[PDB]
């Protein structure tokens, strides 16, 4: 089994997960919705349309009484029509972010770090931790993020499957999902990501690194103590491979979001801090 330190490391992680991850999205309300409606910048738009392109989603709002509101976004054309779902997303992302921040807070190993670092880490891992939480509510069978009463569905497009997979973000959710991971391994993934000793601004590199290794090691043992099936050989390695891919998708997504924010500002105050949105 796991050492007694390990066994309790997973517990504080799980506890933190349970106290800050509103898996039913019951406290997510008062959010915005789509209404009931020149050479340099030109190239910029061309890129934005390519950035928001295969991230297009449908929004469904199943109500208490049994009513069902459904929003199908506009197909590509003109301009502003490709930003109609951005304000709502900004509210989801912000709601998700607040949760992440809480998560890091109750974690004892995080609190014992210099606030500067605690910020560097949150700054450099939010999106990542957010993707890991969303994955738990992703239904790969229907390409839809089931978030309590509201759900986000993927819009089929050019090339279809093999095409969507060209979108790192999309591929990341489908491959991660394929690994059918436990809550314990998801929360360990979050910790390992949170304590990345290589994020910009991080001061105590040697300590954080010591911490990431501690978690990485717990995950590795956990997998051995709970999945000896020769089939699960390399599972730990597949996950680390995933975290690395996620870190790469996160770097691009930031650049992706800036390009968008540049053309059509939308980020919330908090998002601005987290993404360093210039002003």
């Amino acid at each position: 089994g796991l050492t007694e330190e390990q066994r309790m490391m997973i517990r504080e992680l799980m506890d933190a997960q349970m106290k800050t991850f509103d898996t039913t999205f019951s406290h997510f309300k008062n959010f915005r919705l789509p209404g009931v409606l020149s050479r340099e910048e030109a190239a910029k738009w061309s890129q934005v349309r390519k950035d928001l392109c295969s991230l297009k989603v449908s929004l469904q709002l199943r109500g208490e009484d049994g009513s069902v509101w459904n929003y199908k976004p506009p197909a590509d054309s003109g301009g502003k029509e490709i930003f109609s779902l951005l304000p709502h997303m900004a509210d989801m992302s912000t709601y998700m972010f607040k949760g992440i921040i809480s998560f890091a807070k109750v974690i004892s190993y995080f609190r014992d770090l210099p606030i500067e670092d605690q910020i560097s880490l949150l700054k450099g891992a939010a999106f990542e931790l957010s993707q890991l939480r969303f994955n738990t509510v992703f239904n790969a069978e229907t390409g839809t993020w089931e978030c309590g009463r509201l759900s986000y569905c993927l819009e089929d497009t050019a090339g279809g499957f093999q095409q969507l997979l060209l979108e790192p973000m999309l591929k990341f959710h489908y491959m991660l999902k394929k690994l059918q991971l436990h809550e314990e391994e998801y929360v360990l993934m979050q910790a390992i990501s949170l304590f990345s000793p290589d994020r910009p601004g991080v001061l105590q590199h040697r300590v954080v690194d010591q911490l990431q290794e501690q978690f990485a090691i717990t995950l590795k043992s956990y997998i051995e103590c709970n999945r000896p099936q020769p089939a699960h050989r390399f599972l730990f390695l597949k996950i680390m491979a995933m975290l690395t891919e996620l870190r790469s998708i996160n770097a691009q997504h930031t650049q992706r979001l800036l390009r968008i924010q540049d053309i059509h500002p939308f980020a919330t105050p908090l998002m601005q801090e987290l993404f360093g949105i210039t002003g």
Binding site: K98, I101, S102, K105, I115, E116, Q118, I119, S120, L122, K123, G201, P269, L270, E273, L274
Partner: peptide
């Protein structure tokens, strides 16, 4: 400051 450039985030860090 890094703290000074993250009001809310920091503001959220203590409660």
């Amino acid at each position: 400051s890094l703290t000074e450039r993250h009001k809310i985030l920091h503001r959220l860090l203590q409660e």
